[PDB]
Design a protein around this ligand. Structure first.
Ligand SMILES: CC(C)(COP(=O)(O)OP(=O)(O)OC[C@H]1O[C@@H](n2cnc3c(N)ncnc32)[C@H](O)[C@@H]1OP(=O)(O)O)[C@@H](O)C(=O)NCCC(=O)NCCS
Ligand SMILES: CC(C)(COP(=O)(O)OP(=O)(O)OC[C@H]1O[C@@H](n2cnc3c(N)ncnc32)[C@H](O)[C@@H]1OP(=O)(O)O)[C@@H](O)C(=O)NCCC(=O)NCCS
Lengths: 273, 92, 157, 273, 184
């Protein structure tokens, strides 16, 4: 009642700019939910509003949805899916299992999107040509992030790199970083055929291209969103669908508690500590 | 001659004979030259060579399948060689 | 040359240091003086990254930028003509020397007590050369009612 | 080499049925990724494949996408968004912050979708009429899950209950449980105006209706998917978008470490233990 | 049966050196659990075995236990305790609530122990004297990690810094880095 009368001052401890719950209608970054559905944005447009506070063009939202679709799952063998399956077989919980799987997302697993975007953006912005970039990565003892496939090569394309690349070619206004990465890929496949642009490499460079080539962002905003981890969010949100699917799969199959076989563990304990 | 040697060893030539080289008070003139270059040095000299071509030895025209095999040889590190003398032979 | 009028209703100051209570007192004084804008345009704190600090303009909530460096603060705020220096005695001399490399600053208030006299004399000589008025060290500052208040001068509202 | 020769037997410790990473093309529940994009399913179709191993009809996938859109965020005040913001302001990590927020999803927060679906399904399958269901919930000391709004009422509709309800009415073949829930809502709004069908109630009953009225599932499969927590997955996946948005928002605003004010905490420690 | 006969080779995918579950008795880094209790190590000795695979001296184990005791809690206002309380009030779970609180542990909250150890170790190993270290931190725009209290000062000591410092002084053989930090 003192605040209503404006008789006291109390600083707000929190700031927010993405969603307004209070009021008659829910608002996503200045846009009412009814307008969100009338304008026919889907997951991609809602993600643009909630993550970037921008009304992205339709091809940008479609590309974001495609990126979520292609990273949805990559089988049960990877670290995150393995952990989610273990937690589901421990009879645990959907949130607990998905979270157990998601906590593996980082440098070695699931971070290739962010790493590739950063590496290629740094090389492109420094002004060095693709051959200089390849040589510079080589003499630094660093593999190019987003380059290389286990089985697929030139003349045997990834086919989900192909889908995203075709979409980006047909709908994006300009793709400078994608062109740079394709030149780098030409060099690397000249070294050996399977050194192709990855799904991680293509998504990273195409996401940088979308951020800084669609009209919604300035260069500083696009660089900031790459820096604070928007591509980590893309991978996490995409792979959450697969992790939840793995949880539901393990529950449906009624798989019991997992124990790792002792024959697969090498015990190297000290003699007597 | 000095400059020619620098041309020889910067573009990874293995054979380079400019004969005859006619020099008069007006200048030097290269009437003829036969050159063999080290093809494996392409990764060093692709910028300087451009789209360098290596003509086959003068004789029978290369078969489309033989050119296919040559193209295959560049696909990977494997060695893929094929050469014909008479397709009408029975020993294959 | 040292000016005759140091402060007006449009005087903008940069505050060196993290002195949120003093800056809020400054802003409250500006509000009750019916100033159009706050008298503090930016803060400089070297031990943090650039961010925005939440302050009060009357009952409204405003954001004041905090810069790690003098250079960025003076770049983004060329309308600032005053520096209020809350650096301790060990940092005040260097802060004031760095400040007098920007000609936009015409008045510096040094709050710290205990600066060695020789360093103060060097400050005085450089300020005389640059035509910069210094409200000498070991001071609360000063007040121009209706226009501007230095730091904690005059106490609370 | 012994396995390739078929000379030894080793049981596989894991089972999976949702994704096939190995092979030339990635497969989502028996469907190649190129076919997934050619058939123009979006997030909803991929979710159907990965969570249910079914090729859902187009309206089902669209409805799933709509459900993800309306649950994307509900502001920073709720428990999960609050925890995510706290973790982001601790300078922590995208995965860590999102996970900290997601671990609050359970009974009291974010579980009303599942609870409403289960309650209404139990009532509908027991054969009791809506008035009997309302009375039975009343004398059990239980509030109906999915009924009730803070401000919105009849003549002041939720407007994202309205969007989903209009879509379900227009596109679903049959909505028996939704009709049952609407009768229940008529009774409860007769008691007081704001006792309307929630977003949680509408999504829960419409998801049960989609599961058991689209042709993809048998009744046993639909009941199993409700039981093992598919609606929990819907809420978690939808709200992950908002939690990631909140993380990015806090990073962009450069919000420092949060500490809860002492004046908001009541300390009731014992005298001397 | 082929492995028992030694007829096939299969590399182990995991390595471990801290605990041996298989066998008649549980083993903590080469030490049987019965010997762990007979030697009268407590939480500190078990932690030494499991984290460092070492049989630590008794004062080391006691100091580790003391460190665990002094960091046990610092009220409900900090970020981790706040998150744990929020998750508990969401009716959630012990593991879920504790995990929600623990995921805030990092740079800004709970990382000052690691940061201070690293900063002081780097300064000490570089050979610079404490005054040089203070000046170097100052001109780098960095506050010294592990220095500073909200209310407590000289003549008003922390009193749990005092407990640990007294124990370390009385029981540790040598404390060079502690002496360096005290000069700082
Ligand atoms: C406790 C309980 C699980 C014992 O189970 P059990 O079937 O007798 O034995 P386990 O399931 O532990 O192991 C069975 C075999 O697998 C072996 N094994 C255990 N872990 C293994 C691993 N990681 N890799 C390979 N083999 C393993 C065991 O040595 C044992 O070998 P054996 O067949 O030569 O005896 C059972 O009595 C029970 O369910 N009790 C209910 C009470 C309870 O749950 N207590 C909790 C225990 S703290
Ligand atoms: C340690 C360090 C943060 C001290 O900070 P400080 O600004 O002196 O004090 P705090 O940040 O605790 O907060 C200052 C005030 O807020 C108050 N406060 C603390 N927690 C509070 C809460 N939850 N609610 C309300 N008020 C609170 C304090 O009582 C204090 O009151 P005061 O203004 O009357 O003195 C600072 O010296 C530092 O950054 N050191 C670097 C080394 C380091 O990080 N060490 C880690 C500490 S274990």
């Amino acid at each position: 009642w003192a605040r209503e009368l404006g008789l006291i001052r109390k600083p707000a401890s929190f700031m927010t700019s993405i969603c307004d719950e209070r009021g008659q209608e829910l608002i996503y970054a200045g846009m009412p939910i009814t307008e969100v559905f009338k304008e026919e944005m889907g997951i991609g447009g809602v993600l643009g509003l909630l993550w970037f506070q921008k009304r992205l063009p339709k091809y940008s939202c479609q590309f974001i949805e495609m990126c979520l679709m292609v990273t949805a799952d990559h089988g049960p063998a990877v670290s995150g899916a393995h952990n989610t399956i273990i937690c589901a077989r421990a009879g645990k919980d959907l949130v607990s299992s998905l979270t157990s799987g998601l906590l593996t997302i980082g440098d070695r697993f699931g971070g290739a999107l962010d790493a590739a975007a950063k590496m290629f953006s740094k090389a492109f912005d420094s002004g060095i040509i693709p051959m200089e970039f390849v040589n510079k990565m080589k003499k630094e003892g660093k593999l190019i992030m987003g380059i290389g496939h286990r089985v697929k090569s030139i003349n045997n394309p990834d086919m989900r790199v192909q889908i995203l690349k075709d979409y980006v070619r047909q709908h994006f206004p300009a793709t400078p970083l994608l062109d740079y990465a394709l030149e780098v890929e030409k060099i690397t496949t000249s070294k050996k055929p399977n050194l192709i642009l990855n799904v991680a490499g293509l998504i990273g460079v195409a996401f940088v291209d979308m951020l800084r080539n669609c009209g919604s962002f300035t260069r500083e905003e696009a660089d900031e969103y790459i820096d604070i981890g928007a591509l980590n969010g893309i991978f996490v949100l995409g792979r959450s669908m697969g992790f939840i699917g793995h949880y539901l799969d393990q529950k449906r199959l009624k798989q019991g508690l997992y124990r790792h076989p002792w024959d697969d563990i090498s015990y190297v304990l000290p003699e007597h500590m | 001659i000095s400059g020619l040697f620098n041309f020889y060893e910067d573009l990874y030539f293995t054979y380079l004979e400019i004969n005859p080289l006619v020099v008069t008070k007006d200048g030097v003139y290269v009437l003829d030259l036969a050159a063999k270059v080290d093809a494996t040095a392409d990764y060093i000299c692709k910028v300087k060579w451009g789209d360098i071509e290596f003509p086959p030895p003068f004789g029978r025209e290369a078969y489309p399948e033989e050119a296919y095999i040559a193209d295959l040889d560049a696909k990977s590190g494997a060695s893929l060689k094929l050469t014909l003398l008479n397709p009408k032979g029975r020993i294959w | 040359g040292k000016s005759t009028t140091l402060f007006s209703r449009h005087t903008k100051a940069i505050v060196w240091g993290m002195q949120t209570r003093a800056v809020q007192g400054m802003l409250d004084f500006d509000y009750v003086c019916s100033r159009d804008e706050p008298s503090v345009a930016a803060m400089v704190y070297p031990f943090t990254g650039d961010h925005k600090q939440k302050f009060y303009w009357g009952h409204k909530e405003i954001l004041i930028p905090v810069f790690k460096n003098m250079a960025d603060a003076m770049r983004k705020h060329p309308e600032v003509d005053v520096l209020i220096n809350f650096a301790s005695l060990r940092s005040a001399y260097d802060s004031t020397m760095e400040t007098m490399n920007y000609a936009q600053i015409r008045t510096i208030a040094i709050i710290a007590e205990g600066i060695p006299e020789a360093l103060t004399r060097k400050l005085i000589k450089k300020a005389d050369q640059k035509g910069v008025t210094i409200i000498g060290p070991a001071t609360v500052g000063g007040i121009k009612p209706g226009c501007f208040k230095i730091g904690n001068t005059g106490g609370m509202l």
